[PDB]
Amino acid sequence: TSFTRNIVGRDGLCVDVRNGYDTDGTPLQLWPCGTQRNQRWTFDSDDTIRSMGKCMTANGLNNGSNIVIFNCSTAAENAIKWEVPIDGSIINPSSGLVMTAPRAASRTILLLEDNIYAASQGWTVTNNVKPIVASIVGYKEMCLQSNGENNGVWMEDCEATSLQQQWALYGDRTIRVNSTRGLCVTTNGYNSKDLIIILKCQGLPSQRWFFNSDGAIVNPKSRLVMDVRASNVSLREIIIFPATGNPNQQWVTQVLP
């Protein structure tokens, strides 16, 4: 009834108990991923998440409160229970606040903040601490392709040799240009028909995505899903749109060699 994994988030860095100290109150931070014990988190059926025999703990339950390691028995019960929603958040049920990395840098200290569905609030519980590299196959068995910073994404015939068809699926729930990992698939607004482009990763809600069980790629803040505009690949426009279940909104990841 328990299992142990890393937790990968912002910029592909991992949740790390700072300096590897286990004394009560030691902050959680981002640090490059590894196998050290202070990055190994055990998920127990009691909804605790433990490292080095101690619990991930909200040191307070307010906007901006720090998350620390603390003795599981002596901490407040409200402070040591967590849930891992399917969209990749890590939520403290008592407060409703979510784990947030407010900066991308190593040594950034993790905070509970109001959920805004930001990419800074996306996490992946996994033993593979590298981004998964895949083509994103969609409408007409075509492949999603990048076309540079600030430009639209669009569909093209799948080519094993097209680097701009290769996507790094990061633990913070961002979809990144594999060959330029500072750049993120980004919706240019949260309204229906807003265009999906490539922009510098800035941890924004516009840069967060969820691969749901229906084959959709969902932007959690807007609720909207990636859509090949008008089922017309020649428009070279991918938008966000309400989920319809139609072929122009169905996507599969295909892992690359």
Ligand X SMILES: CC(=O)N[C@@H]1[C@@H](O)[C@@H](O)[C@@H](CO)O[C@@H]1O
Ligand Y SMILES: *[C@@H]1O[C@H](CO)[C@@H](O[C@@H]2O[C@H](CO)[C@@H](O)[C@H](O)[C@H]2NC(C)=O)[C@H](O)[C@H]1NC(C)=O
Ligand Z SMILES: *[C@@H]1O[C@H](CO)[C@@H](O[C@@H]2O[C@H](CO)[C@@H](O)[C@H](O)[C@H]2NC(C)=O)[C@H](O[C@@H]2O[C@@H](C)[C@@H](O)[C@@H](O)[C@@H]2O)[C@H]1NC(C)=O
Ligand U SMILES: *[C@@H]1O[C@H](CO)[C@@H](O)[C@H](O)[C@H]1NC(C)=O
Residues lying near ligand Z in the complex (CB under 6 A): 53-54, 63-64, 71, 73-74, 113-114
The per-residue DSSP string of 72-109 comes to: TTTS-GGGS--B--TTS--B-TTT--EEE-SSSSTTPB
Kindly provide the b/e burial profile for residues 170-191, where b requires at least 16 CB atoms within 10 angstroms of the residue's own CB: bbbbbbbbbeeeebbbbbeeee
Instruction: Tell me which residues in 234-253 interact with ligand U (CB under 6 A).
Output: 234-235
When the beta carbons of 33 and 80 are compared against ligand Y, the nearer one is 33
Minimum distance from residue 126 beta carbon to ligand Y (Å): 15
When the beta carbons of 36 and 95 are compared against ligand X, the nearer one is 36
120 sits near ligand Y (criterion: CB under 6 A): no
At 106, give phi and psi (nearest 5°). Answer: -55, 145
Q: Rounded to an integer, what distance in angstroms lies between the CA atom of residue 143 and that of residue 155?
A: 5
Site string for ligand U, 198-237 (x = CB under 6 A): ----------------------------------x-xx--
Q: Name the residues that contact ligand X, by CB under 6 A.
A: 16, 18-20, 31, 36, 38, 193, 227, 229-231, 239, 241, 244, 246, 248
132 sits near ligand U (criterion: CB under 6 A): no
Q: Rounded to an integer, what distance in angstroms lies between the CA atom of residue 141 and that of residue 124?
A: 28
Classified as helix, coil or strand, 247 is helix
Which among ligand X, ligand Y, ligand U, none contacts residue 252 (Cβ within 5 to 8 A by kind)? Answer: none
Which among ligand U, ligand Y, ligand X, none contacts residue 235 (Cβ within 5 to 8 A by kind)? Answer: ligand U
Minimum distance from residue 235 beta carbon to ligand U (Å): 5
When the beta carbons of 13 and 55 are compared against ligand X, the nearer one is 13
The burial of 5, by beta-carbon neighbours within 10 Å (0-12 exposed, 13-18 middle, 19 or more buried), is given as middle
Which among ligand Z, ligand X, ligand Y, none contacts residue 53 (Cβ within 5 to 8 A by kind)? Answer: ligand Z
Minimum distance from residue 14 beta carbon to ligand X (Å): 9
Read off the amino acid at residue 61.
L
Which among ligand U, ligand X, ligand Y, none contacts residue 133 (Cβ within 5 to 8 A by kind)? Answer: ligand Y
166 sits near ligand Y (criterion: CB under 6 A): yes
Minimum distance from residue 87 beta carbon to ligand U (Å): 33
Helix (H) and strand (E) counts in the chain: 0, 22
At 185, give phi and psi (nearest 5°). Answer: -65, 125
Residue 257 is encoded by which pair of tokens? 């060699």
When the beta carbons of 158 and 235 are compared against ligand U, the nearer one is 235
Read off the amino acid at residue 140.
K
160 sits near ligand Y (criterion: CB under 6 A): no
Minimum distance from residue 234 beta carbon to ligand U (Å): 4
Q: What is the 3-state secondary structure (H, E, C) of 8-58?
A: ECHHHCEEEEHHHCCCCCCEEEEECCCCCHHHCEEEECCCCEEECCEEEEE
